[PDB]
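assembly run, all chains below
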Amino acid sequence: GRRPGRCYRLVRGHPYPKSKYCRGVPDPRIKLFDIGNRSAPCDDFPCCVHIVGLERENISSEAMEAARISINKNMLKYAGKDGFHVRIRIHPFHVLRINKMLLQTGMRGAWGKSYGSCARVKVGQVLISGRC
Amino acid sequence: PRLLKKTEHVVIPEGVNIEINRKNIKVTGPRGSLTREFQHPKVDIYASKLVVKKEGPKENVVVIDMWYGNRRDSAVVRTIASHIKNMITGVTKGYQYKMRVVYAHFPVTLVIADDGKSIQVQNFLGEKRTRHIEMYDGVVVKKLGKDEICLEGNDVEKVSQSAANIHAANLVRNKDIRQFLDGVYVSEKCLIE
Amino acid sequence: GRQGNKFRVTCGLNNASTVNCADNTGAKTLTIISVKGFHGRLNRLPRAGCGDMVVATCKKGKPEYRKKMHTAVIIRQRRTWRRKDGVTLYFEDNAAVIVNMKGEMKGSAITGPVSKESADLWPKISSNAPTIV
Amino acid sequence: GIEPALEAIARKYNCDKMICRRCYARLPLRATTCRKKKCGHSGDLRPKKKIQS
RNA sequence: AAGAAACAUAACGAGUACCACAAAAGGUAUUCAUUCAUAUUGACAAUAGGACGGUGGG
RNA sequence: UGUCGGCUCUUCCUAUCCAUUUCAAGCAGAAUUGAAAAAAGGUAUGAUUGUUCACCAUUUAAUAGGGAACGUGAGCUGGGUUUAGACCGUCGUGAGACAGGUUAGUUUUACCCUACCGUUUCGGUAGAUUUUCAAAGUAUUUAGAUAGUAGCACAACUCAGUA
RNA sequence: GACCUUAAAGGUCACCA
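ok done. output:
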């Protein structure tokens, strides 16, 4: 049971990181951010491509993890393990909030609970980069 | 892009006489006459003498010309030229479409009228309904051998559509067409002469 | 298992109509539940005439037939119905015989007259009928 | 009871065509685009499945 | 209110902001532009021919 | 602004259940499954429950999903809910409380305007002048802008125990 | 869900329509 992606797409509110004031935050889906030959010398791979976001929006941790797996499976099949190095350059430091409602419930007197994590990106910000 | 001038030409052979009246070409040959109307408001059809060979002499041609006009319109210049080329071919060496009858178990008997303006397909896949299929004017059916017929005529559009009408009247319905390979199919299309 | 068509026979037997069983199968009476081939309508009750195969339950009979759903054929009815040749006809009581889907009668004998319409529809009933009226 | 010569002309008229995965419509062999307008002129097509035994 | 040039228009497409709605995606649909290759002494499309021997390994 | 459901009746939507026309299948036939055109026509009978819902037994070509002030009470009913009588259980010292259960409980007015259905009365259409013509009145015979629209479905024989 | 208590577990409330 997860809310539609359109609920938490727009960048709203002050940044709300996980700290001593924000407790009970679920672990983000994505844990590995550098994939491929992370130890390859700077001269082996001269090429460079980027994914540049053209929108100011929230990117959930699930979307980054799905993209990380998608590139991993496709790139391993094509260029092999030791022929590419992809680094994800957006981290889920912003924590979303959900106000779950159970009619015996309070109507509007409540402040949301932690729901997930997302990366507040902006226009022209590099999301994922890779060298081959 | 818009083309300043797109042109095409058809070579008129000796036994062919062509007269044009406001995009209405009439072609007369040794096998008869053929009139068609090309109602496109942006083509100029006129007969002239042109050198179309690399080092050949002048010859009577029909020039289909359309001036400044986009690629949607310009495509019709060669379309009309092909129609006129087909019309010349029809009145000199007419077309014929050799259709063949394909059956698995039930034999199909073809009954052709005496004059040849109608056919009759009987016992197609055991069906009791008998198909008639009328023929266009100028198209004549006849029986070549066994399970083979041919439609003779001067206009390819009349001969080709009449041949397709025969095939389209003998379609298998509600059955696997990959297994019940039945009907009348055009084996090949060729010229009488 | 029925053979051929049946002309118009006005249906005087409704849903929940109790008929008699003319067979020798130990079932006495059946009550019609629904009629095979009946085309439904709003608030309409299922209707059966002579020669109509109905679905009925036996509420009176020997234990292997009571409190069960069987299939029967109306052989006679008290409702007056008209033949095509201008003959107006009706019987003394509503009766039926138990047949299956294939049309063979479960019993071996029929007591009382059997109408022509039910006799022609089902060849097995006519063979075991005493008289055909 | 059909000779192989007549098989070729019958199969071509019936079997040797491509099928749009979105139109569902019958398309020629060398086509590269769903011809019908309803399917959006899609670009992914598959050959008609051959019979087998 | 007249003239000018274009991308549209074979469709209930377009048409006076706030305003009375439309998205991701797809298209050998069309227009312009950029980058690369072949562009001729002969590219692409087409018609005609060869497409091979050890080797059951152009 | 009379608050549930059912009964009666009309219309509308298609995100279609059947019938009609097509395309696809891992479609041999039969039975099926996915999709397109199409909303003109059909889409039932009962046991239990106030029920909407649900679950069973049938039948049918099918027994599809929805809107119209959660359509419809000066259209009905009053089963339920929801005053005032009474009973039980739990709670409360008590009066009393209970989305806890049970039983009995008044359903008013159209004669007004419009809508709809039928039905009368009065009024009436501008440009021709061949007296074999033109016009007005009365009467018959016709005419047809527009509006509605109607026929559907199934079964049996033969095809054929054939493909 | 809310309040209370224990070392997750219970206990009381969840009403007028």
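The helical segments of chain D are 4-14.

Residues 24 and 39 of chain D are 8 Å apart (CA to CA).

not gonna interpret more than that til we talk
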